[PDB]
Design a binder for these strands. Structure first.
Lengths: 404, 404, 408, 408
DNA sequence: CTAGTGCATCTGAATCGTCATGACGATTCAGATGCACTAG
DNA sequence: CTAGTGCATCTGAATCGTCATGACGATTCAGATGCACTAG
């Protein structure tokens, strides 16, 4: 068990499997590795052990780097990475801080992910520092050997279920809907109560399919998740009439010399003919807010702000593309539309479904719910910013409204 | 190290130190696991290991399966599965055939997915056999070392977002590679045609009642016209889940000395709980445009402009009510709403269904058709200004879309 | 002398002619042409005369009796042949029958001019509870503000005075106000170094100059055309709204909707450029009418006037054609107006909005009620693409508020 | 009929009148009043009559000959008492003597309004070789510009169109026809327009002083804290944004959403009041080198940073609590800030918006790609309740564009 | 004696047709680069 | 783990065809400007 301590300014860890073989490797290569992550040198060793004394009584004293400005500074040659790493005194110096399960280096992937040579700072009051609870979240959800075996087992299960009965979970729910359909529809005459029971069964089917996709189909492609969500967009939002995929729009602002082609992934036409955009994003992470507030205000994530800005680029290119774009989109999609209706670009807006919010089971302050409600109406060209749990809550509220 | 070879009908595994540890573990628990995926027994040794013979010089031999009709018959105890595995002789026997990256079981997950007790045949001319060329397609879809590296970079990028501004774009690199491998065959999509005829039968039932109301029920009163449309409002606009009638609104502006009670005739509640207004008016012949233009522009008529101002006064007195009106409207309407939902006044907007456009029989010009679309979008707090002919036009566009 | 009386169903009136005038003329003209015109407006055939005059009876004691109209459903239905018009005239019983209903000063027919304006056949209904009826207060405003011989002579005198004033001395009152501004500026700027207190006093002098020039144009320059009125208001539009950097006139827009086959040219009269280069428009309308709300409310709500709604609809055509024009509009308006702009700056159409200055609202008289003020602010904030809706009195009130805020 | 015939040096006019009219009233008015108003435009004494009428002779056979003046040096000199003015009127011989020269359509006096508009004592000279003379083509353009019968008919139809616009749907567009007719008769000239060059130099000095103070604060006041950076930028907020007339500091607003059980006080740092009374928020922040863009794209899209999103979220707190505060907030803010505001002004919370000045863009230093500026301007126009997001370098760019526009 | 209507005449603007030109988008093709999969 | 290598991708000339805009020339219709008669 590696034991960490600090003596005055310097930080001297104690290490205690043959100790004599570690000394022979340190004399042989001039470098030694402790637990396949902590690389060390003879200069990092504070004092050499003598061969006369017992090596088992002696504990190995290695320098972990100097402590400066209230920061345990660990250099890059110890962790075999590019930049240094700074740890605050509030994070206890421990083997599990620098290592994941089955000897996976935590900061090696972080150093491979950062282009800038500026150091990684954990904790404290630095402006570029990572907070403490974000670091425990990174330690809990690191892609270690247990996570990467779980991802590979879930993907191979997802590939093999796609080859045999790819939509068997939605087919069972649709067969349950068809069994509930003939029970409700006893007579061929349609009234308002039987219609309300059929809307209850339809919204229950859509809610159960979306919940079963959230439980089991999260380890899919973005195109596969979108192809899961296409046949229910016009039922969740019955204003819109047609779902259009890979809609080629014209961009003139990113390259001023020549027109660039851009592609809206999912686009929506309502009954008047106006074109709108929906962004159905795959729920990779379970947050809609950053887990620490900036200045006691919770800010949106990079995943939320990426989808808003992509939809705003689509809205910008449609509004700049104008009546030439109206004629081009009504020439591209005249056969798919009902007859007599043309595609119009008249102030297009966007719908964003991103990823989960953890409103349920608690774990949210009134300020967090206030920031989430303010953020869902913050933007100009978004008529709806939804999470997947907001979609399930809207479906549930529509179910108990149609019941009563 | 595993070598795949076959002599006569038998198939021989060779494993190349730790050879003694495999034979010692076979004596303890009467089962071993070699390369994490293959299970062998004491019967499974083609020749037994010898203690006087050196285990480094000794080479393991394991009768993997029998060769009958060019099929290698693997028992299920080796792969720890209930079902048998048969592989054609055209498929080369390899560790990559049985195992993907991170040592997941290819026939382990496949056995769990399968429901039939027929065994798994790979290759050959059998009708129950998996084809060889689609087994290489399944093996190419399985995650290699580049996918698990891209998933590990994207998972850290999902956690540390908004804290490290200099990280590489790993979420874009992961999802662009994952779109190349799609698990959905797309010919197994859910056929929702039985739901779509019920949406046709719902929208035709709304369209036939309203068109019968425009021809015969015009002799009824204004409140008798509103009563007829109230059960179809939440079906026509499924964003709104609750219809509220005679909603008392406090007025502080028409009389500055004392509060005045004002009444919204029909009010609408969203699934989130936001409060909106619908103004259902009696249809007459020309209720949108005046007969003569003003300064070559067709202006709204006095019947329409009084209808917008009646809704805009309701929006003004709701917005000026503030947080004291959200507590008042929730307390008056908690039993009508679903549980856990409060009425919130967060930018209320109005829907007006007024008059008949008479676009066809009237044969209005392109100048009049230009002015007709501008009036519906000329008001900040009106999301939808409709005629009853436009409501029938939007209902007909739903029916033609759901048909094809 | 004409007097109106109600016997039975049919409305009668008696022509009491002058003693010097021979009453026989009405009867000999009815014998000759079968029509007679008394008081130059009212026309009567022989079937309208109830009693033909006896030749033995002296005419001066006799009074003629004419079927002026029929009273039915509390409405006096005057035929159009009486007023020499094509449509009927329906007068409510609350409006008493006199010559002043059908005449302005020096025998000007009200319903003749009104009938000429109407292209259809449908009758004119005055007063009462019909939905097509002109109200009684609106009819009294029509009688008070009719273009009679007094109004047309006053309009011609004001027009001739405006034209002669344009020819000689041009704009003199604005030059005198600018000379007063220059004198106050020379009093205030005693130091070449510019200070924030001196800047506030110079902003006070500039805003009093703009307020007095707009007030003098409202007092004396109402009878000019909109080209002349917009030429009066354009050098102070940038100073009134200093977000806007350049005033552009006769901006050629392309309209692809009014005709789907071919592109139509449209022209914005005044268009404004921001400092970013965004292009918004302004509608400066000449104040022909003294009101901006309708005089009677429609079902307890005060609806806007046709002048205001026409200005909003014209600005919405301009905003719609600029938004539909797209990036080709930005390239065309950049190439058309490159030399007018500052260097390195281009026209961009990114959600264009409009400012409307239409005409007066009579708030400062105090005749408006609380609901009329409430409906006035709701109309001012009602529309989507209009950032500012102004009257001229709202412009003067906002200028006075900036002056009193800068004074402290 | 009026005929102007000259006999040697003097010029007479024959007054025919009408056959139905009796022109004995001319000699009767000359007998008692000693003046007669001929054709409502001319005045004549008893000495102006050439031949006195005889009672033995028939009046209708006699034609009244009044002298109009004396012709000398090819100039018809008309006395001022003839046209009822102070000064004389000189008409050249080349201009035909007619009633239309002296009168317009509605019997207005052209030389009457001309002598009313002329400041000096000197007589009106029309035509000829004199430089003081009004030229013949200029006077004929003035006579063509005067209102004829088609102008008054269109004005009358436009006036009763303006009275009855909301009550009669079927009236023809008379306002469009009258204002389109008036646009071809312009009054003002472009040479007479007001030269506001001296006023525009003061605006150049104002925006130059503000730009130099802001740029010197960017170069050397980086060390200054955030609150005193706000205190530096407060006296220029009204000048940069002249829509807002009052700057309010530490505005206590009431919050009911963060704590349902009890009300918490929230404090807007700087708040702005319109000239109408609408309340807005300005968020003046400390400038930094990279606080707009996050400098690495997320899905090939540059996302806003944590600092800018925190500023937007704080302004959205202030806008949300002002909107949820309602009418009680308007009475509370009016009661709290009655003495700071001008008289007659109340604070109204009617859709409040925010302006955020955040930090330097770093465009020319960064040399960013056109996609990066595209992501940047989409960030500036992304949010609903922010009317105008800007940087400090963007503020300097708008100031430089305003200065270069006011230069020319 | 002003209000009101009818008419002949000149004129300017909306329109249609045609012709010319230039810009712009679709298609091709190739050279080169970035990516990603696999073997020593 | 790292280098070789094949493939998908982006990007720049480069041609071509079509469309959209502008300008000219005839045309006709509605507008506008006077005369002109008319009513006790």
């Amino acid at each position: 068990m590696l034991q960490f301590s600090f003596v005055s300014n310097d930080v001297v860890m104690t290490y205690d499997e043959q100790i004599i073989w570690v000394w022979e490797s340190l004399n042989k290569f001039q470098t030694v590795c402790i637990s396949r992550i902590f690389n060390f040198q003879l200069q990092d060793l504070r004092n050499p052990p003598s061969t006369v004394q017992d090596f088992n009584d002696y504990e190995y004293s290695f320098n972990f780097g100097t402590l400066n400005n209230e920061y345990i500074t660990v250099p890059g040659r110890i962790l075999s990475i590019n930049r240094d790493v700074l740890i605050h005194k509030s994070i206890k110096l421990e083997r599990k801080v620098f290592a994941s399960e089955r000897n996976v280096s935590i900061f090696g992937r972080l150093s491979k992910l950062l282009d800038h040579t500026n150091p990684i700072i954990i904790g404290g009051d630095k402006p570029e520092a990572i907070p403490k609870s974000v670091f425990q979240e990174l330690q809990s959800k690191f892609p270690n050997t247990g996570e990467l075996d779980r991802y590979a087992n879930a993907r191979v299960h997802a590939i093999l279920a796609g080859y045999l009965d790819g939509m068997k979970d939605a087919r069972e729910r649709y067969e349950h809907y068809l069994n509930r359909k003939t029970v409700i529809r006893k007579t061929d005459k349609l009234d308002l109560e039987v219609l309300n029971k059929l809307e209850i069964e339809k919204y229950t089917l859509i809610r159960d399919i979306i919940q079963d996709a959230l439980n089991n189909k999260t380890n899919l492609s973005e195109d596969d998740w979108q192809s899961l969500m296409i046949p229910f967009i016009t039922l969740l939002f019955p204003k819109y009439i047609k779902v259009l995929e890979k809609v080629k729009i014209f961009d003139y602002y990113s390259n001023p010399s020549a027109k660039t082609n851009r592609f809206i992934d999912i686009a929506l036409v309502d009954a008047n003919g106006n074109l709108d955009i929906i962004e159905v994003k795959k729920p990779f992470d379970d947050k809609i807010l950053r887990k620490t507030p900036y200045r006691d205000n919770y800010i949106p994530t990079s995943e939320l702000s990426g989808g808003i800005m992509q939809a705003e680029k689509y809205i910008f290119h449609l509004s700049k593309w104008g009546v030439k774009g109206e004629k081009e989109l009504t020439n591209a999609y005249k056969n798919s539309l009902p007859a007599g209706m043309c595609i119009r670009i008249s102030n297009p807006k966007a719908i964003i479904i991103v990823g989960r919010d953890q409103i349920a089971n608690g774990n949210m302050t009134d300020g967090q719910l206030l920031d989430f409600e303010i953020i869902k109406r913050k933007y100009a060209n978004m008529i709806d910013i939804l999470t997947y749990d907001d979609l399930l809550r809207r479906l549930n509220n529509t179910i108990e409204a149609l019941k009563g």
